[PDB]
Design a binder for these strands. Structure first.
Lengths: 94, 97, 79, 106, 92, 106, 81, 99
DNA sequence: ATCAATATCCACCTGCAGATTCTACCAAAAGTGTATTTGGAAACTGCTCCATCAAAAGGCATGTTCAGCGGAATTCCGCTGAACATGCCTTTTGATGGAGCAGTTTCCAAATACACTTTTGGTAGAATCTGCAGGTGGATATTGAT
DNA sequence: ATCAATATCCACCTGCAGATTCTACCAAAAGTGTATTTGGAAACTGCTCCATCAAAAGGCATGTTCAGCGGAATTCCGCTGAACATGCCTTTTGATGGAGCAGTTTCCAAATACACTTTTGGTAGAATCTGCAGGTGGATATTGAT
């Protein structure tokens, strides 16, 4: 039985970008491997940051520095934007 | 008719850099995998997907080592990669340090 | 032999994908020896994961986890 | 405070990312915005590769994205290539490329 | 700020009774211990998760040691580890 | 009795067990874990100290310094691998000149 | 602060090639080396300083540098890690 | 009649000398300004614990000395004895630093 | 420059392995609401140590001269890989029992959580202890000129 | 080979900075001792999917031929290493003042902890569909020969 995967949310995103393009299974498998990988690297660094600073909590602040530390210049620029935006919109909504 | 040496090679290069199929035959490979593992633990069964991953990894590894090797041969103003060229590459990669 | 089962044509096919035009004669034997060390390193690790899980079957994840700590992360077969 | 992903305006599972952050043993506690921020970062990066891979596929008279198309999108992008600098994409092959000195003398 | 210094010293004295260690060296020994400590626990940590186990036991620790250390070092490390666990298991 | 004595060890078992918790590696830690990990830590510092100790002797020294540590690690196949990506401050490199660089013949 | 890279003199860069076992040195090496050291420092200091900021500190500590180095796979023993 | 060592003799003396010691080989102060220059012109108003400046120098020299060994190997591969920029470059390329 | 031999490109075709679509079951999710707990920011602030200014001096960087030798260019040529056609042996493919990999249930040794009590390793700090760096000289190699 | 200029080796000697030696204090830490909770081993078991196999299938092993690669021998130029004079700026020793790291205490916005409630993503079994991979064909670019 039971095996989660980012496969559907990947597919949803694939449609806001290439509404008429589709993806093969082996490919989806790679995108899933891609998300889990980034997830871990970002989480891990967040983890370390907190520990270095003697903190029990991983916040978006930690997630942010982690992205800074993890991603290449321009890619990290957008990543921060996207991220700050999602937290803003979220907070400003019951 | 006859093609000059190197002509068919570049043809072979252009062709293989276009494709993604594996270049080692599955059976001989699987045999080599099981053999090597038999020294780590007797009576082992391999998921077909596990052997597949090992092969996908192995080839991707060699294909890259051959790139760096080609770069070492070229560095020495040659066009044919040699054992020393692999040797120098693995050494700079830390696979020997 | 098994390591001899990984043949010249195939080793030459690989070199090609890597941009190699001319191949010396002693490469093939060198290539294998390297392929051997590669697999012995990765499998050993993968097989350690198999035992920890108390299984008799090396799984694709067992390999993926070994490859990752070898620094050879592979996408497509799990995790 | 709603379906969290919808609130953040995201396609990724803000609730699942949060669940995985905890089950992951990264810290004793996990703030409320961290999973939102992190899910936003994943989704964006996901769009980025799919965006480039789509182009990769179209540019081959193909409508469905396969590994090769993911590999081409990645290694042809300076930054992605960097991020996945120590990653192997199964069935991706390599970029066409012949060392100049090896081409027949024109 | 805790160290490992008195323990490194104790062990120093066991192997080389008449030798000392400069503080800069004691410092490198401290980084060494903390390093291997993290490496092993990390390996231990992931091993647990890959296996959906919520507990790190001497068994994960031992696999992590096998996963992390080179051949001969590992054999000996694994031996000292089992030996200690067994003895601690038989004592209070 | 300290758990170190019960385990027959010099390294502080409690301290380790404790550091395992604060480090967040899993929801729980067996008591056998810190015992084993302190044994392995202690064995490792003994091995490097045995070899550093000799390096100092070989240099007519009594107090071990970083360079000795470096010599012991770089001269030992396995310690060298275990520490293949570690830089021991103030340790230098091992003396070593390539053959082709030495003068004369034979 | 300006042109400080030129403070990595030819004599010093030469001393380093020596410990590295290098016997003879071509003329363009000194600038090639300065450029390389420059990138090395930019990479470790950026990460180092990212750690400083995250800690809302104004002083770059040895641990900041030690963590940046560990990040870059260049782990250093001797300064708090 | 003046005595004069042939080219390469002193060079080997230096290799034997430096490979035997462990003191940093770049001037303390000059290296510090370079650090502050780079740090500052990437975020201003920063201060440095003396030991943070020493760890960067310890990491930097250990990095470069190892780089020179690889470079020396690449030169020898090309049957030369004097290292060139192209050697440093081949080494960083394979090391996966520029690729 | 002129064929002749091939390899490559491309527009069209289509059968099917794999992608898509529909429908219903359901436990693990994820959201909601309540009650309690607490991490860590804020504000007051001790005190560590960073930036910095001063000053004297020799260890090193700089810049020059000059000649030796390293490396690039070039000609040779011995021999080794690349291309190719010849012929069969090993890999591939689709097919069939059965071994383990998982799904499910039990219950027990062992792991929290909590309340005390005792052992200990950091440490602020005055005080004597000691391995050896750095200076010395003078008997032993190592170079390089002849 | 023999000689002479020089750097190397090294055992002795001694200053001094860094290491070792406690006295007294202690908070947190490691240990002792119930009480309560539960992770995951141990055993039974269904059912995937892995090992084995025979037969349709498609490389690869083999020996000849020679094109061209790479290492050897040679040569000349100019760049780099040694040696040297000179004087700069790094190193060293010290002390000053203050920014800022880091400790201590106060306290609320946010996080943990259930537990009731609603929702969803993953799985299974079935039928329908479609991007495209091999296949064909004939035009044409490329390569090698004369």
């Amino acid at each position: 039985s039971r095996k989660e995967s980012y496969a559907i949310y990947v597919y949803k995103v694939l449609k806001q970008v290439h509404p008429d393009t589709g993806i093969s299974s082996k490919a989806m498998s790679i995108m899933n491997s891609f998300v889990n990988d980034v997830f871990e690297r970002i989480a891990g660094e967040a983890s370390r940051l907190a520990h270095y600073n003697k903190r029990s909590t991983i916040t978006s602040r930690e997630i942010q520095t982690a992205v800074r530390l993890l991603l290449p210049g321009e890619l990290a620029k957008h990543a921060v934007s996207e991220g700050t935006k999602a937290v803003t919109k979220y907070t400003s909504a019951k | 008719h006859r093609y000059r040496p190197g002509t068919v090679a570049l043809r072979e290069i252009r062709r293989y850099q276009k494709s993604t199929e594996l270049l080692i035959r599955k059976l001989p490979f699987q045999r080599l995998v099981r053999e090597i593992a038999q020294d780590f633990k007797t009576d082992l069964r391999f998921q077909s997907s596990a052997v597949m991953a090992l092969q996908e990894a192995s080839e991707a590894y060699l294909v890259a080592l051959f790139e760096d090797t080609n770069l070492c041969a070229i560095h020495a103003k040659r066009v044919a990669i040699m054992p020393k060229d692999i040797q120098l590459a693995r050494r700079i990669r830390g696979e020997r340090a | 032999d098994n390591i001899q089962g990984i043949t010249k044509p195939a080793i030459r096919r690989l070199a090609r994908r890597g941009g190699v035009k001319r191949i010396s004669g002693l490469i093939y034997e060198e290539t294998r020896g390297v392929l051997k060390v590669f697999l012995e390193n990765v499998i050993r690790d993968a097989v350690t994961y198999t035992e920890h899980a108390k299984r008799k079957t090396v799984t694709a994840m067992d390999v993926v986890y070994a490859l990752k700590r070898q620094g050879r992360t592979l996408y497509g077969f799990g995790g | 405070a709603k379906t969290r992903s919808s609130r953040a305006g995201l396609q990724f599972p803000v609730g699942r990312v949060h669940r995985l952050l905890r089950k992951g043993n990264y810290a004793e506690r996990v703030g409320a915005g961290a999973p939102v921020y992190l899910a936003a970062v994943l989704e964006y990066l996901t769009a980025e590769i799919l965006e480039l891979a789509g182009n990769a596929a179209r540019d081959n008279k193909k409508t469905r994205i396969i590994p090769r198309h993911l590999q081409l999108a990645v290694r042809n992008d300076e930054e992605l290539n960097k991020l996945l600098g120590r990653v192997t994409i199964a069935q991706g092959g390599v970029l066409p490329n012949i060392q100049s000195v090896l081409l027949p003398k024109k």
